[PDB]
Structures are given as C-alpha cells and as structure tokens.
Structure 1
Amino acid sequence: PVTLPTGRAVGYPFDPPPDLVKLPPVSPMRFPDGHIGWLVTSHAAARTVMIDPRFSNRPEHKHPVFSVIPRPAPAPGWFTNMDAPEHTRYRRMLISQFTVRRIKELEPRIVRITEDHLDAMAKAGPPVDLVQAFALPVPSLVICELLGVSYADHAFFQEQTTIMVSVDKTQDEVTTALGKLTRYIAELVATKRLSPKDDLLGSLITDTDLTDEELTNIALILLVAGHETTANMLGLGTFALLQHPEQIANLDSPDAVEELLRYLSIVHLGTPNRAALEDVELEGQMIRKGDTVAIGLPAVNRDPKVFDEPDILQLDRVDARKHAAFGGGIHQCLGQQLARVEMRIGFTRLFARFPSLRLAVPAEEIKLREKSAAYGVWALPVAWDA
C-alpha cells in the first residue's frame, strides 16, 4: 500500500508527482487512520468512481484522505458530502440559480472587474505580484457580487477560505475558520431575509423554502469554492503560459481554457474520493464494500489512453474536453460555467494588455501550494515593458 503521493519534481511545477504517475491504474493506498483502500490514476477507472451509484460521498462511509475535516451526518445544506436523494434537493435548487441568464448577465461585470485590475497594474507599474494584483481579487470580487456578500470584508474571507482548503492545518484551526465564516454569513442571511435582492443568495431566499441554516451552509460552500479555484487557475495558468510562450498565440482557441484545466489539474490530492457501498471491480482489482477509493486527477488528466501527447500543454489540441478537472457525476463542479467565463476573460485580457509579461524572478523561485487541496502559486512576481 502506498501513501498518497505528494512531491512535485523541482523544475516540473505543472506535472504530477512522479510517485503518482508511476503507479498502476488502481493501487492499494494507506489512509492516515490505517484504512487500506485505493488510489486510482486511470481515466476510465476515475470515471466509474465518479459516476457509478455504488459509490458514496458520505463521511459516515469514508475514511478521510486527510485527517482534518472542514465541516460543521452532514448538516442541512452541507450538500457536498451528501448522496442522492438528499444531495439532489440542494443540487437542483443551485442549478436553477447557476442559469444561462445569470452567467450571461454577469459577464460584463467580470469584464469590467478584470479590466479595472489591469488598469491598477498599469498604474503601479512593474513588477507586481500577480497573485495579489489580479489572480486573487478578480474572482474574489466576482463571487462576492454573485452571492451579495460585501467585498469590503475580502481580506477576512480570503484568510478563512485558505484555511478551509488547506491540508496543512489542525482540526482546531479549521473549526475556527469555519466558525468565523458561519457566524459572518448567518448574519448576512438574516439581513437579506429583510431586503430582497436578485443575487444568487437573495434568489435562493425568494424562490425556495431553504432554512437560514441551509442558506448559511450553501453560501459558505460557494464562498470557499469561489475564492480557492479560479484564483489558483489564473496564477498557475499564467505561470504555465509564461513557461510555454509559444502557446500564448493559441489562447483564442475554443478549448484553450479546457486545456489549461486538464494540464494543471489544481484539485490535485486524492479528490474526488468515494466509499464503495458494494464490491466493485475496477481495472485489475476488486474494490470491497467499505473501501475508500481516492482519485489522482493530475494523473487521470495525463492518461495516454485518452490524450495525444498528454504531457504537452497544447491549447489547440482536439481532445481537451475529455479532461476530468471538474470531477464527474452528480457532484461534478457546480461553478464550471462561471469559472470558465472568468478564466477566458482573465487570461485573454491579461495577455492582451501586457503582451510582454514575464516572470520577474527565476522560475525556480516560484513557491507552490503543495500543502493546499487546491494547487497553485503562493506568489508570482511579474514584469513587462512599461
């Protein structure tokens, strides 16, 4: 049984850990609590774990990949960790708000937010840390506007959300962060009950019978995911593009954002993971009832059975959309259309405004989020011809 692989090679910051990609498709894995379950690296096996009803996401059934659990049986509205049919009730309500119209109507504000941060970079002049100047705040402001949350408290949010998604923090640190967020959002929900708005949280209040508790947990989940996904793509994607400069000319390819998603696979440590409810055969192996199965997405997204030249970033490839960067099945990313728009706008406008963008330090000095559940760069010093 192996331990979940963890170390990226020096000089190969975008590629999965060597100890992950060396593995067979389905391997025995030792969990922190002694459970011997499984780690899956092939795309076909990952697909089955993500879509097959014999697998559960309930914490009662799962041995944790990481000991420290950021969660409040799942509390009402904490839909991430539920199975169908309880999950279905919340999922459906949220699909009915992540609509075509809501995202269409948001796009001009995402354009303005992005352009404003680019203007601020131009005023500052080079160098800047792209993480603080652009990658963090643009999607932070977008998610705040989506939810009706005040961006004036973003520094507070960002600090708590980083704890929430860490794999490096104590149970007390994570319980503390969750508490500070819960209390903050609970009050916001109480306020919004009195004064209708058309943002996503205000629409959930108007259109559904969700309780204040349910609304608070939904909002907390969305607020965390909005602060810890897109920002990491913008930062690590920019780094990848600077390191593969011939791909910049391919940024308008229709599937370019999809290729960055596949290549970088920021949900990088043993997620999704699921418990077998019955015995299940996968690749060589017999998964037993009660076994937890973790997926190594980064390896899944480099499967040579699925992708041409899998270890090359190629924004104009024809097979990017087989990637599993957003998961699959009933828990597949709820925010994927929003994230897609934010990324397209973010990357295109950054390089259109600063075509001479370059790293302001050696590549080897960029520090990476190896100890977060969402992979990315902690900082990205950049410069350009002013």
Structure 2
Amino acid sequence: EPVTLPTGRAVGYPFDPPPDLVKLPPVSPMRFPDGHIGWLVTSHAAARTVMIDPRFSNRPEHKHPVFSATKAPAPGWFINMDAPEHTRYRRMLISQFTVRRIKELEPRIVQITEDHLDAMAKAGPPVDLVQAFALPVPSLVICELLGVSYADHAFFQEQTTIMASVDKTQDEVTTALGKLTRYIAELVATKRLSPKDDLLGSLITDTDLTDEELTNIALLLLVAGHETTANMLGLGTFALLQHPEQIAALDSPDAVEELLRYLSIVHLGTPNRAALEDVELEGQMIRKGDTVAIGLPAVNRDPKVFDEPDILQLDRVDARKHAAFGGGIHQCLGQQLARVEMRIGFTRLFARFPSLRLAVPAEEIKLREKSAAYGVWALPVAWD
C-alpha cells in the first residue's frame, strides 16, 4: 500500500531518521501530495542505481513535487538539467571547486569563523548559535566565493538570513529571494565591465556564459550551499553536545564525513527523479513517468553498508560510503567547500569554547522537520 513521505522524528531522538522511513522495504510505493503514486528508495544499493542511471531525469516538467512543475529550467540552473545540457555547465565549474582552488579561500573562511566566535565571546553567554554563527558564517563564505563587495555584506546577509530563518512568512522569503536575485544580476553586470580572478570573473573571462546563465549559477551556488552548510553547523553542534565523548575525536580524518552520514540533513525525498523509461529496481518495476524519491537518512544507515549505523562515531572506518552529497552527475559540486567550512567551523567553535553547552533543555530545541535542509530553528548555547 502507498505510504506518505515519513516526516515524524521520535521524541528524544532528534538526529535519527523517522522510524516510518527506517521500517520500510528498499523500494516502496509512495503517494505524493498531488496524488501521483511514485516510489521511495531506502537502500544504499538501489539509491546508488537511481542516482547514476541515465533513465532518471532531473528536469522539473517530468516530476511530481515531493512536498507542498511546468517551466523549463532557467539557463544556467543546471541542477535541473540532464546531459548533454548539464554537462556543458558542469565542465566549466569543475575547476572552481577542487581541493586546490578552495584552499585559496581557507584563510578567509578561518577569519570569518574567528570573527564570529570573537563576537560571541564579546557578547557573553547565552547566545543563539543559529543567528550568531551557523547562519552567518556560510553566507559570508558564499559572499567570498561570489566576490560580493564588503560594503554589500550587510545587505547579502540580511536577505540570506531572512530566507533561512524561523518565523518568516513565505512572502517574506520570496521578497528576499527577489532582492538577492536582482542584486546578483547587477553584480554579474559590474563584473562583465571589469572581470577579476574570483569565480564569476574567471567564468566571464574563460567562457561564453551569458549574464543570465551566470546569474542563475551564482544563485544556485547560494541556494544549494547556504542552508545546507548552516544546518550541518547547527545540528552538528547539537549532536556533539549530546555525544560529547566524540569531541576529542573531532580531528579524526573522517570526522566531518561521519557527521554528514549520521545527520543526513538533505532528508526529505531528495534526490528525486523522473523515470524516462521503464526501469527494474530491486525487483520492483518503475514505469515511465514515475517519480522516484530517495530517503537519504535511511540510505546512510543501511545495515548492509555500515556497521553500528545508528551510533555517531567520528573515528569509524566506514564513513565514506555515505551518500550525504548525493550521487551521479548531480553529486554536490560544492562538496569540497562544504567540507572545509565544516572542518574549520566545528574545530574552531570547540577550541574557543571547550565548555560549550546547551542553554536550554534538549527537549526544548525546535527542529526543522518539514524543511528541505533538516536542522534546528534555534540553538541557545552557553559557556563558562
């Protein structure tokens, strides 16, 4: 019988998947919000198949929305494209996201992070880590990536904070997104006049990308990279405070990978894809026109892949099989930047405040249960 997309986390188990997801067989029929009866995939093996197989399309016309569709993806909005279209954009951006090119940003990521930790030390405790650190820091990292001027930091942060914060209406969000989008078009127009060696400057120089395509690429980087990162930083801090034996393990080489696996913040039927043909999948028959959604949090706890899947274990040997970054052609472009932001962010936070603790009971922390990026709405913390 078709299940609805599981949304309910067990009280007192904020980091673990909904029990109604973990309970399911590998491939389940799913009733979508519009009535479509598609599929939800929960095994690591079957998920991998969906992510790498070309008979699954990410074009939005073919797809039934996962919660809450017409329209070709705007030029440059390459997440929602298939090869060969996807490939053209992806090939030009590769260069900008290696270990090597991201390394150039590290010193500024460091300073941004320390700046924010300085502001927390200066205000003294208690502080909401979400607004003081987890939201702002990754937004200012994107400002650097995109080469936003310093005079425009306050504006960029304001709109980006609105989009990502609790107690904001849908109209407020939409309004902020339009301000941000207009600002990016203007930023791209300025850089066209005098291109530098930032991501956008390099692209204007080395490629035939139009203003429109650059605008959409910059926006996509913002939208895919802000809330994701912010929420790993916030929920990850939560997890570390609730499992503090792990803090001493934070320098382990795969510690950020284990946090990515355990938390699986891209948590609600994403990635999802439209079948372009009939496809057989773990003995089920997906038909042409069916939407297939992946339940990453369960993929990342698959007992055929990971030992003791439900324990947070920063020095685990098998963290790197996780799919927290997706898979296939759309596998996260910003993966290397995220990793560095998280490493730098978790490490400096705990070095500065070895005494950090939650400033309210754990039961009081509010969770982003229906949001595309799972996390906490607020994280009051204190220190000595």
Question: TM-score, normalised on structure 1?
Answer: 0.93
Tell me how far apart the structure 2 counterparts of residues 235 and 128 of structure 1 sit (CA, whole Å): 13
Change (3 A) 1:103 1:365: same
Map of 1:70 onto structure 2:
none
Change (3 A) 1:174 1:54: farther
**Is the 8 Å Cα contact of residues 166 and 377 (structure 2) preserved in structure 1?**
no
Deviations 1:328-359 (A, max 9, x none): 00000000000001111111111111111110
After TM superposition, give the deviation of residue 164 of structure 1 in Å.
Answer: 6.5
Of 231-240 and 100-109, the range deviating more from structure 2 = 100-109
**Matched residue pairs, number?**
380
After TM superposition, give the deviation of residue 124 of structure 1 in Å.
Answer: 1.4
Tell me how far apart the structure 2 counterparts of residues 357 and 118 of structure 1 sit (CA, whole Å): 12
Change (3 A) 1:168 1:300: farther
Tell me how far apart the structure 2 counterparts of residues 381 and 170 of structure 1 sit (CA, whole Å): 23
Tell me how far apart the structure 2 counterparts of residues 169 and 381 of structure 1 sit (CA, whole Å): 19
Deviations 1:52-108 (A, max 9, x none): 1111101121112134xxxxx112111110000000011111112223432111111
Of 154-163 and 292-301, the range deviating more from structure 2 = 154-163
**Is the 8 Å Cα contact of residues 98 and 336 (structure 2) preserved in structure 1?**
no
Of 114-123 and 292-301, the range deviating more from structure 2 = 114-123
**Is the 8 Å Cα contact of residues 5 and 30 (structure 2) preserved in structure 1?**
yes
Deviations 1:180-238 (A, max 9, x none): 33212111111111122211112111111100100110011111223211111111000
Change (3 A) 1:11 1:151: farther
Tell me how far apart the structure 2 counterparts of residues 62 and 150 of structure 1 sit (CA, whole Å): 38
**Is the 8 Å Cα contact of residues 96 and 102 (structure 2) preserved in structure 1?**
no
Deviations 1:151-192 (A, max 9, x none): 655565456557878999998776655433321211111111
Tell me how far apart the structure 2 counterparts of residues 152 and 7 of structure 1 sit (CA, whole Å): 43
Identity of aligned residues (%): 99
**Is the 8 Å Cα contact of residues 110 and 344 (structure 2) preserved in structure 1?**
yes
Map of 2:29 onto structure 1:
28
**Is the 8 Å Cα contact of residues 271 and 294 (structure 2) preserved in structure 1?**
yes
Of 295-304 and 365-374, the range deviating more from structure 2 = 365-374
Tell me how far apart the structure 2 counterparts of residues 288 and 156 of structure 1 sit (CA, whole Å): 47
Tell me how far apart the structure 1 counterparts of residues 154 and 9 of structure 2 sit (CA, whole Å): 29
Of 300-309 and 153-162, the range deviating more from structure 2 = 153-162
Tell me how far apart the structure 2 counterparts of residues 317 and 176 of structure 1 sit (CA, whole Å): 44
**Is the 8 Å Cα contact of residues 267 and 372 (structure 2) preserved in structure 1?**
yes
**Is the 8 Å Cα contact of residues 29 and 37 (structure 1) preserved in structure 2?**
yes
**Is the 8 Å Cα contact of residues 233 and 376 (structure 1) preserved in structure 2?**
yes
- Please state whether the residue corresponding to 2:274 is helix, strand or coil: strand
**Is the 8 Å Cα contact of residues 30 and 37 (structure 1) preserved in structure 2?**
yes
Aligned 1:1-386 pairs, distance under 5 A: 1-67=2-68, 73-150=72-149, 153=152, 157=156, 161=160, 176-385=175-384
**Is the 8 Å Cα contact of residues 136 and 161 (structure 2) preserved in structure 1?**
no
**Is the 8 Å Cα contact of residues 166 and 371 (structure 1) preserved in structure 2?**
no
Of 231-240 and 107-116, the range deviating more from structure 2 = 107-116
Tell me how far apart the structure 2 counterparts of residues 96 and 153 of structure 1 sit (CA, whole Å): 27
Tell me how far apart the structure 1 counterparts of residues 168 and 30 of structure 2 sit (CA, whole Å): 22
Of 374-383 and 257-266, the range deviating more from structure 2 = 374-383
- Please state whether the residue corresponding to 1:281 is helix, strand or coil: strand
Change (3 A) 1:174 1:239: closer
**Is the 8 Å Cα contact of residues 165 and 374 (structure 1) preserved in structure 2?**
no
Tell me how far apart the structure 2 counterparts of residues 33 and 178 of structure 1 sit (CA, whole Å): 26
Change (3 A) 1:164 1:155: same
**Is the 8 Å Cα contact of residues 250 and 316 (structure 1) preserved in structure 2?**
yes
- Please state whether the residue corresponding to 1:29 is helix, strand or coil: strand
After TM superposition, give the deviation of residue 110 of structure 1 in Å.
Answer: 1.1
**Is the 8 Å Cα contact of residues 166 and 373 (structure 1) preserved in structure 2?**
no
Change (3 A) 1:157 1:376: farther
Change (3 A) 1:160 1:114: closer
Change (3 A) 1:213 1:354: same
Deviations 1:127-164 (A, max 9, x none): 11111111111111111011012465556545655787
Q: Any unmatched runs of 5+ in structure 1?
A: 68-72
Tell me how far apart the structure 1 counterparts of residues 297 and 372 of structure 2 sit (CA, whole Å): 12
Q: CA RMSD in A?
A: 2.1
Change (3 A) 1:141 1:162: closer
After TM superposition, give the deviation of residue 284 of structure 1 in Å.
Answer: 2.9
Deviations 1:291-345 (A, max 9, x none): 1100010111111111100000000100000000000000000000000011111
- Please state whether the residue corresponding to 1:175 is helix, strand or coil: helix
- Please state whether the residue corresponding to 1:23 is helix, strand or coil: coil
**Is the 8 Å Cα contact of residues 141 and 151 (structure 1) preserved in structure 2?**
no
- Please state whether the residue corresponding to 1:27 is helix, strand or coil: strand
After TM superposition, give the deviation of residue 371 of structure 1 in Å.
Answer: 2.5
